[PDB]
Amino acid sequence: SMEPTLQSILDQRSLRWIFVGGKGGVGKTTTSCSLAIQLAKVRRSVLLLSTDPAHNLSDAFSQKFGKEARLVEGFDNLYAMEIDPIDEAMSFAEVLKQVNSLSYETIVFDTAPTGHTLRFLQFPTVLEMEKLDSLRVTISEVNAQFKDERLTTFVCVCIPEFLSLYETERMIQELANYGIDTHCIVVNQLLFPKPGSDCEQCTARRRMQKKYLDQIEELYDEEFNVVKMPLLVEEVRGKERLEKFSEMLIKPFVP
Amino acid sequence: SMEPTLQSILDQRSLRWIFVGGKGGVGKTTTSCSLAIQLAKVRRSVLLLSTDPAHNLSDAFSQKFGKEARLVEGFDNLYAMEIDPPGIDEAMSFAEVLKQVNSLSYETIVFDTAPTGHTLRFLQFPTVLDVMEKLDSLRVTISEVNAQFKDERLTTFVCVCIPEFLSLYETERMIQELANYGIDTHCIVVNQLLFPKPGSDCEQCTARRRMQKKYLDQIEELYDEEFNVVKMPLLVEEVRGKERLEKFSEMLIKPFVPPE
Numbered sequence: 276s277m278e279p280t281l282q283s284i285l286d287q288r289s290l291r292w293i294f295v296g297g298k299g300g301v302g303k304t305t306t307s308c309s310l311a312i313q314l315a316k317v318r319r320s321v322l323l324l325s326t327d328p329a330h331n332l333s334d335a336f337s338q339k340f341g342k343e344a345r346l347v348e349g350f351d352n353l354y355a356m357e358i359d360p361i362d363e364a365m366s367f368a369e370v371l372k373q374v375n376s377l378s379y380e381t382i383v384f385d386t387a388p389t390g391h392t393l394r395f396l397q398f399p400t401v402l403e404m405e406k407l408d409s410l411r412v413t414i415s416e417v418n419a420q421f422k423d424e425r426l427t428t429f430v431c432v433c434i435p436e437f438l439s440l441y442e443t444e445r446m447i448q449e450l451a452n453y454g455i456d457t458h459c460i461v462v463n464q465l466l467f468p469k470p471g472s473d474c475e476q477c478t479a480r481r482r483m484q485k486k487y488l489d490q491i492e493e494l495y496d497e498e499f500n501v502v503k504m505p506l507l508v509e510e511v512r513g514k515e516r517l518e519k520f521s522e523m524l525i526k527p528f529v530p
Numbered sequence: 531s532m533e534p535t536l537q538s539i540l541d542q543r544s545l546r547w548i549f550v551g552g553k554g555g556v557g558k559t560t561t562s563c564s565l566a567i568q569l570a571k572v573r574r575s576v577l578l579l580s581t582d583p584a585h586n587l588s589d590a591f592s593q594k595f596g597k598e599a600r601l602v603e604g605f606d607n608l609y610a611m612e613i614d615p616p617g618i619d620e621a622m623s624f625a626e627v628l629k630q631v632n633s634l635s636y637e638t639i640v641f642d643t644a645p646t647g648h649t650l651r652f653l654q655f656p657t658v659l660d661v662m663e664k665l666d667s668l669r670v671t672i673s674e675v676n677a678q679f680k681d682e683r684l685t686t687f688v689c690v691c692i693p694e695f696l697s698l699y700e701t702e703r704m705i706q707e708l709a710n711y712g713i714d715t716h717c718i719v720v721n722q723l724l725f726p727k728p729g730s731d732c733e734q735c736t737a738r739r740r741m742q743k744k745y746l747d748q749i750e751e752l753y754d755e756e757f758n759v760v761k762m763p764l765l766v767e768e769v770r771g772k773e774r775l776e777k778f779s780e781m782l783i784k785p786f787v788p789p790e
């Protein structure tokens with residue numbers, strides 16, 4: 276079994292690209308933000324890069340971000356930018372190459388649901404004058420980068436409902452097929468009733484989620500770090516609340 | 531103020547295209563489904579059309595759907611399909627789907643479509659926009675689509691959201707977009723509302739209704755008078771299968787109101 280924390284992401288310093296994925300709503304951003312805050316604590320510098328056509332990076336930190344990286348207020352180490360990339364993904368590849376030439380030690384990508392993620396992958400494995408070679412080559416490289424387990428992983432985020440877990444299975448399975456490494460699941464928005472507190476809803480709710488949780492661990496227990504974030508009463512926004520939240524990523528919540 | 535229900539949608543018999551929109555996860559499918567079930571009850575027939583590259587329609591009903599319409603098991607009136615339409619042609623394709631579909635005999639279509647980003651881009655498209663005979667035959671069918679989106683007898687959007695910051699904010703943006711494009715919208719469905727049980731004192735439960743209520747209050751203060759603001763409660767189990775989805779949909783048309 277495996278420590279239910281992202282300590283390993285912190286420890287694996289070769290990591291250059293960390294992708295965060297999951298169904299809509301599960302808390303992809305909240306996590307990306309959290310994760311980068313934690314990494315930024317033990318790296319030379321960290322870039323938080325969001326591709327949502329709209330961007331919730333700024334909304335997350337109540338600070339205007341842009342296609343121009345900048346320092347996240349309250350950190351001197353963390354930066355964030357918000358951009359907009361059979362060929363809606365050539366442009367996407369270029370960003371990476373260019374961005375990979377920047378001096379940020381680690382990059383945490385926040386991205387539009389597997390739809391476009393999964394579509395990018397679909398790409399290398401589909402393509403199969405020197406401006407033909409030259410492009411492809413450039414994918415070749417990127418692609419190797421993705422499959423290089425020292426350089427790239429995926430973090431899966433989900434909640435304990437049917438559709439979310441299902442998609443998490445498919446995703447884990449795709450990444451495998453593509454040979455992209457993944458070894459972390461973040462199960463978010465867990466309702467932990469308060470102890471000695473009897474609530475029908477509260478109880479029954481934990482009852483149903485727990486039936487998912489159980490399954491998640493029985494299945495990924497041994498080759499995934501399965502973190503478990505609690506559902507908070509307020510949204511997780513602003514430097515403060517995100518930092519607190521993020522601690523739970525690294526050292527397990529257990530009430 | 532306006533009745534907190536989707537009765538008007540049922541009563542608005544010219545409606546041909548009903549789009550269900552909102553942030554990821556808010557319950558767009560669960561609503562689309564619910565809504566269609568209700569309409570199907572008071573229309574000749576109703577098509578439930580999902581474009582999510584996701585197969586969430588089948589998941590919703592535990593039944594295999596596809597690019598070929600079929601009867602939803604347990605109804606004799608309701609059908610569903612699941613298809614896959616710069617990002618030009620594709621918006622171009624999206625229009626072909628709309629046109630193709632529109633010429634079938636289904637009295638009403640409820641579109642389950644993706645987060646704001648994905649329909650929008652397309653909407654943004656018209657204004658901005660022996661073979662050439664097709665180049666043309668295209669602009670033409672885009673004219674017709676865009677015409678129809680703009681005819682309020684024919685099209686409306688339903689906005690789904692939950693009572694958290696990002697969701698409401700997007701709902702605002704959408705309502706505002708639809709206005710700019712002159713597409714009609716007059717229903718908000720506020721989903722996953724925690725109503726604590728009466729007499730039940732719970733820290734979490736209480737506090738949580740506290741924070742949501744501060745959103746709701748705002749939602750009504752703002753859209754109260756020109757939107758039907760429905761309020762679906764958060765249920766303990768996922769809403770799946772014909773049965774559960776039916777019960778849920780009832781609340782779309784009769785306001786849920788459990789003692790405060």
Ligand SMILES: Nc1ncnc2c1ncn2[C@@H]1O[C@H](COP(=O)(O)OP(=O)(O)NP(=O)(O)O)[C@@H](O)[C@H]1O
Nearest residue numbers: 299300301302303304305464505506507510511554
């Ligand atoms: N565990 C939690 N407890 C309380 N609030 C949370 C939790 N996780 C996320 N949130 C809040 O719930 C909403 C969704 O989180 P968010 O990270 O935006 O999900 P997401 O996957 O980024 N959404 P999307 O970009 O549409 O796929 C935001 O308001 C968050 O601040």
Ligand SMILES: Nc1ncnc2c1ncn2[C@@H]1O[C@H](COP(=O)(O)OP(=O)(O)NP(=O)(O)O)[C@@H](O)[C@H]1O
Nearest residue numbers: 299554555556557558559560722763764765768769
């Ligand atoms: N009011 C509710 N009570 C209980 N469960 C709900 C409620 N609304 C939605 N759900 C469950 O929430 C999950 C997601 O709802 P769904 O209709 O899939 O959201 P969505 O907006 O379509 N997600 P996406 O298409 O990825 O943006 C499903 O498990 C539903 O059963």
Ligand SMILES: [Mg+2]
Nearest residue numbers: 303304305331
């Ligand atoms: Mg996000």
Ligand SMILES: [Mg+2]
Nearest residue numbers: 558559582586
């Ligand atoms: Mg859906």
Ligand SMILES: [Zn+2]
Nearest residue numbers: 474477732735
């Ligand atoms: Zn409770």
